[PDB]
From TrEMBL, chain A:
Organism: Leishmania major
Protein name: Phosphatidylethanolamine-binding protein
Domain of life: Eukaryota
TrEMBL record, chain C:
Species name: Leishmania major
Chain spans, region Disordered: 46-139
Compositionally biased spans, kind Basic and acidic residues: 78-88
Protein name: Uncharacterized protein
From TrEMBL, chain D:
The protein's name: Ribosomal protein L30 ferredoxin-like fold domain-containing protein
Organism, as annotated: Leishmania major
Superkingdom of source: Eukaryota
From TrEMBL, chain L:
UniProt superkingdom: Eukaryota
Identification of the protein by name: Uncharacterized protein
Organism: Leishmania major
Organism ancestry: Eukaryota, Discoba, Euglenozoa, Kinetoplastea, Metakinetoplastina
Amino acid sequence: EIEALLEFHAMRPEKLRVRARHRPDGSVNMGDDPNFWAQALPTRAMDGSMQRGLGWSRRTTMGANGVPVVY
Amino acid sequence: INPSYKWLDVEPDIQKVYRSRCMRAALQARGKASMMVAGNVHYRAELDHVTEPHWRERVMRVPKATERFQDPNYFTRGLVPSLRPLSRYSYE
Amino acid sequence: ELLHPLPVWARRQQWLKRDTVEMNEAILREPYYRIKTFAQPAAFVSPRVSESAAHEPDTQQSSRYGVDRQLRGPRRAVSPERLQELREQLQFVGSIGPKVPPAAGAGTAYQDEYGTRLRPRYPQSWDTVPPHQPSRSEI
Amino acid sequence: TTTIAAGPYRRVGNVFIVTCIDHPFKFSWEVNRMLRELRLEFMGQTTVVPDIPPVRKRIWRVRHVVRVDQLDLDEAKALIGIPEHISFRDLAGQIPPTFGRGGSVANPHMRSKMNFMRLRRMRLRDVMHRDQLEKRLLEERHHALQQQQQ
Amino acid sequence: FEEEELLPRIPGTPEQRSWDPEIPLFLEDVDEFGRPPRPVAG
Amino acid sequence: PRSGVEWHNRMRNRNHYRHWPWARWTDDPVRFHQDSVCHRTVSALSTVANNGAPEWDYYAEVGQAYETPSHFPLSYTAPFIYQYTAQCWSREDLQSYLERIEQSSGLRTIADAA
Amino acid sequence: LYMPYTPVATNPVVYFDITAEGDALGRVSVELFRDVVPRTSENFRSLCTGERGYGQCLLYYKGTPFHRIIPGFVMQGGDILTKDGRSNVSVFGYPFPDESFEGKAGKHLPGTVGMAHSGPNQNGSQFFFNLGRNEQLDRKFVVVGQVLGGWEIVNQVVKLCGSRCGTPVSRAWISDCGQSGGYMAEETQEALQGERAQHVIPGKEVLDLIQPRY
Amino acid sequence: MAGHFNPTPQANSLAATHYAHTPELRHMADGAAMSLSGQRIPLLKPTLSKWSRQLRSDIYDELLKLPLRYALHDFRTLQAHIHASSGLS
Amino acid sequence: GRRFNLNFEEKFVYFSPFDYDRVFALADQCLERAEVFYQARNDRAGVMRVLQQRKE
Amino acid sequence: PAFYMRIQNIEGDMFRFEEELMKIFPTKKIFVRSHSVYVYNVNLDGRAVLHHWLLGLGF
Amino acid sequence: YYRATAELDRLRGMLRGRARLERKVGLKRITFLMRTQTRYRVEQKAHWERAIVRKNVDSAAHEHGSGWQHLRNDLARQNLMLLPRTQQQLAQYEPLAFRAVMELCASRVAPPPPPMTAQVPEEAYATRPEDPKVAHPAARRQLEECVERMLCTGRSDVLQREGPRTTQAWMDAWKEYDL
Amino acid sequence: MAPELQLEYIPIIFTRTILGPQGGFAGEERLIKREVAQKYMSEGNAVTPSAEFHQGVWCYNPDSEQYDRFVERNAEFLDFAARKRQWLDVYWRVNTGYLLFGRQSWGQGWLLNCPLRKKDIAQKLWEQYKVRVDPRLIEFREKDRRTGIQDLGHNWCWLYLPGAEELAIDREVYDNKRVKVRMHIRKMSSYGALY
RNA sequence: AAAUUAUUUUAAUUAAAUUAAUAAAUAAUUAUUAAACUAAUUUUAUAUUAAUAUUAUGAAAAAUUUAAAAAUUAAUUUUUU
């Protein structure tokens, strides 16, 4: 946890602000919900269509430290 | 007591209920589940009464102002763990 | 608008309606199954309780005597042990999986003779219609 | 013979033959929903649904629309000439699962991409065929070459 | 379904059985109308 | 009553309730889908000991129709205990445990063991 | 009763938790001959750990019943879509063809799993645990592995639940499957750790005893 | 909140062997094995770009698994990314 | 096909030559049997001129 | 946000090329044209799958 | 909006006065008189036209003391299956044959039985001990019931013998190709 | 107990014999609504079940008009106050209830085209009120003995509650042997109407 | 306000809420283009979405509900190639 306190507190705020119309999961964050104005994981619109359709493994999703990326 | 006053319970474990529902609804499919379950909507009226048969009297009982404020010396002598004088209403 | 009365024939043919529904829900409260015995006949008369006004008894010129000809007749698979005596003879020709060829006397398999994609040249005609486009059954 | 018959007791289900006697377009959106789950839309349509429990409700809600008929399974194994020993969970284990209008996927697009790939696994079935001819000729062209030097 | 006992023994879906009073209640170890005719009927 | 547009946006997976039950089943906040039965045991012979521990009540919250009257012997609560402890002891193994209890101890009946 | 095999190092060792008649039998730890059939031994490995998610269906052996058991010959299972045993899919999305019969994969031995197929070049998910030396299955069905743990478990499933016609006399299925070693053993564990599960199936109080994810 | 004081049922015996019901948290949660598994920013694997040609093994299996004619080079020999002074560049 | 995202299987209408051509199927099957007759006879010069014939 | 790929610089028989994409993407609509090979519904992760293949093929 | 003029432009030749001369009134007339025919014809002509045919056969069944009320139901009793458009051809051009159908229904002759559903040949309940050379008892059951029916249809040259032709050797016509 | 959460109904031992549905009779224990019961414990018709009253209670006779009649509640009376309650619970349930319908009525005479059966009243008794009876007891009026109910709007018909003579039950119900079940036939189109 | 030019076709539907010195703007609908198969069941049955385009405030016969209504209003299933 101590390592996460820093990796979250040494991020320039702009890396946290709401940064795209589609939240990293795929929903469309409209206005009026102050909780969802914070987009920690950065979205990637043009990436990830191989997963969940071609039988590509969940092993590919994950990053180098093991935690999955979302698409 | 009064079916007009409701609470919202969130029980944190989602597997604790899912892995029972998937049974409770797999048992009652084979006709092997009993309908006197606590969670049955129409049984709760009788369920309480099988276990606590005089619960009406446990909430209807009016407390004398003596016992509602148990002897403050019993608090210094430590007999009663901590006096709560305002918590007087039985919300069951 | 509803001005002149419903003609009588309509009300009468609508009293047959509620007496259709009153005959559906008689079917939709039957037991989900029927505890039956192997040895006994299949349905010796054994209908539902539908002997309110029983008809078509004539055993011919009766609609059901293509079926109850065989139900009332003595049941051949007369025991659960007799079933395996009968169920151990049937094969499955096309099912997915492996087999044991020499189980027969001298038969030499077909699908390993004309390949898997080729089908026998069925004579196409009006009465005889064989399966068409066989390469669409592979899912 | 005045005796409860004695023997190993098999139980036989029932199979409902359902028809449609009233038009569907007069009824609600829920009653039309049940008829849809009985493969019934037009008047005079007819289907053969099982007597399993959640079908018994669907048929019940629309009793005023359909005309049911019940068949014990032995009274079905004879309606189509069937040997008594052959069950039905081996007869169905023979028909392919891709019968006419294979699946009912959640919307006519997902239908049209369930029929698409079905028309692809045909293309791939000939293409996995056409290279399996090459991969065997290639593995031989290797051995002809390899054993050439010996 | 009959193989995994999944077919219920009580005939008629839950909602249906509340609708029609001819499917008798499927009480087992009690009498339908409360107390049994303790009084001799005859 | 489920009126309102947001119930239209979230029953159907509309704009940002696009994966609406944001916590559906198949997530456990507590035990993260790993069985809580310690396999790291002092002696390898006794690793099979912890198998079959109750993770919750298993019996009351389900509400099965135990038609066993409370005066039966213990050996007639085995068909219930098993359905939650298979993968731990074969059914015919319980009937070796749920008999040594009846033989050795002074307990015989379901009412006694309660 | 005895069971030899061909022991190998650094291969996936995959286990089923076979259940029959509501009596959990145990755990049948297969090994997968990766060194010879790298394309097939992966398809099996992927369907036994729920790794590869949705293709045409829930690509996962957990729950699916042994639709075809023949006493003394084979113990077939799989057929993930329409579990009553008439389909064949791969994690790839199409029924791929068999790789090799050269050796160690074209020898159906009395303790060895082979990936059954409809037509020669159409391998899929349906396997079978060979129960005897079948010299007419050599060169045709590709051996994918071998049974390390619990031969008496499978030699029972064939007794209780097997009939000459092939269709089972009772119920039997795969109450659980997973990977217990080999290559990508832990690298699959990170693919399955966390709150939200990969696949959604009835609680393990159901699949284990009562019903086989029909 | 007031915590957990006014201690547990206040009974004692040799038996004392029937209860866990850790407060949910002290059961894989407050044994903080991996809850950051969901709440930690990912470190993405090598990314193929238009300019940066960083290969990845995780994708290369999804080709090495395929039933493809025209086989592919083995991964290690497909790598541009690994004795004067322990070998020069 | 004039549609793309619904009723679009009509752009990928495929009919296997093993259905709409029977003289081709046989020709593929004769040579396949000619592959196994040389497989037993061990005529590797022949199994090629079977395969290199069949693929063409 | 619905993407397609385009394989523009190929010569040879695209069909024996496109018949090797099908085995990769058994679910993406692939069309062949004179110069290119369009494969639909495949975004910048599919772009990454190709080059890990066009390197494996040795090009 | 396309009025199919060149499809009507030459067909005003059979309209009456003002319609033929001018065009925008000629079309308007015919593209209505045409637009009502093909609406009269789909939904209205039958349930009129098929009532002349019913009024004919009726009053031609009426001559023989029966009604349409009784004939329409006494035909389907005898499984006789003559569409009313045909009974009207018989009512007129073949009166005797029609009254033959009339006198049949009034007769108390047993109508034909409903067709029997398919039956289970009892050889399915024996297990042939599989010998290579002997046929299954259920095939030589089916065959004999398919060859006796092939000799049933049409006067042919096939082993032409009076009445019933030769069978017990017709079932074994494969040996005639044997060496 | 709180001023907000009050018992919606409370236990009560009746001393008098009240006619109304919430009413009881001599000596039975009943959970009647709180507001009603609270103006009984002041009125004297009822007393909360102290352990003393659970054996006997001095009920009331209109003869001398005072609380003299001692009605001791042994196990035998508790088999009498059950059958006498279970009886007049069917009474006060069908008499209080107003069982609705939805029917089709094409035509002018406001005539239900498929008129009602005594089957179709016991069916709407068990459906809505769960009152399970014999449809042989339901006597229709004179206007609807011929053709069934047959007409929209408010119809009523008599239900005969036979077994009320050994319960000593009169003057505490409006009619010892009958009860007016009160139909109503709310015509509806094929959308919501049956039959 | 009046018009807006090319038949033989090949996927369906209505909606009714925030606001208006009272309707060019928003939802919701419809539309164009495109999408991915999360437990629930039959071996049933399922138009769910994204992206853009969008000069709209009032729902037959019922079932009832406001109102002197003397209909309007709420209502909600229709709404023909």
